[PDB]
Amino acid sequence: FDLNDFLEQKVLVRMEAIINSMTMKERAKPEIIKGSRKRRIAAGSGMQVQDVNRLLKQFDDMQRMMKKM
RNA sequence: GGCUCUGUUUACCAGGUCAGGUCCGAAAGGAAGCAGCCAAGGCAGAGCC
Ligand SMILES: [K+]
Ligand SMILES: [K+]
Ligand SMILES: [K+]
Ligand SMILES: [Mg+2]
Ligand SMILES: [Mg+2]
Ligand SMILES: [Mg+2]
Ligand SMILES: [Mg+2]
């Protein structure tokens, strides 16, 4: 379960936008998204880095649930 | 070394086109710009000079 799976699953638009600014490697392994990539993704999606942090957290909470359920 | 062909590789760090998202505007209209793709660069094989 990665960001591609989360992608398929104005807030929803904002969330898809952040994923749209990512490279395929970032969507496949979100853990590689550190400071520099967050900044690139944020500016590229018209968001603030804090918005990218919230999206990544939500993705993480979902991945954790899927791993279980 | 150079050029060409072919394969492959490359988040951002002055290229092009820029979906989505963003920004300015009441609108008409504009703008910046990530991903992708393209170009280009990296690593090689081959050919030519
Ligand atoms: K090549
Ligand atoms: K682009
Ligand atoms: K952009
Ligand atoms: Mg680039
Ligand atoms: Mg550009
Ligand atoms: Mg648009
Ligand atoms: Mg408006």
Instruction: Show which positions of strand B are touched by protein (CB under 7 A).
Output: 11-12, 19-23, 32-36
DSSP state of A22: S
Task: Let me know: does A30 contact A2? Beta carbons within 8 Å.
Answer: yes
Return the CATH number of A1-68, one of 3.10.105.10, 3.90.1300.10, 3.40.50.720, 1.10.260.30.
1.10.260.30
Q: Which contacts qualify for A7-15: CB closer than 8 Å, 24 or more apart?
A: A9/A62, A14/A45, A14/A47, A14/A51, A14/A55, A15/A55, A15/A58
Query: What is the structure's resolution, reported in angstroms to one decimal?
Result: 1.8
Q: Residue with structure tokens 């550190």? A: A34
Confirm whether any atom of chain B, the nucleic acid strand, is less than 7 Å from CB of A22.
yes
Q: What angle do CA A64, A67, A69 make, to 5 degrees?
A: 100
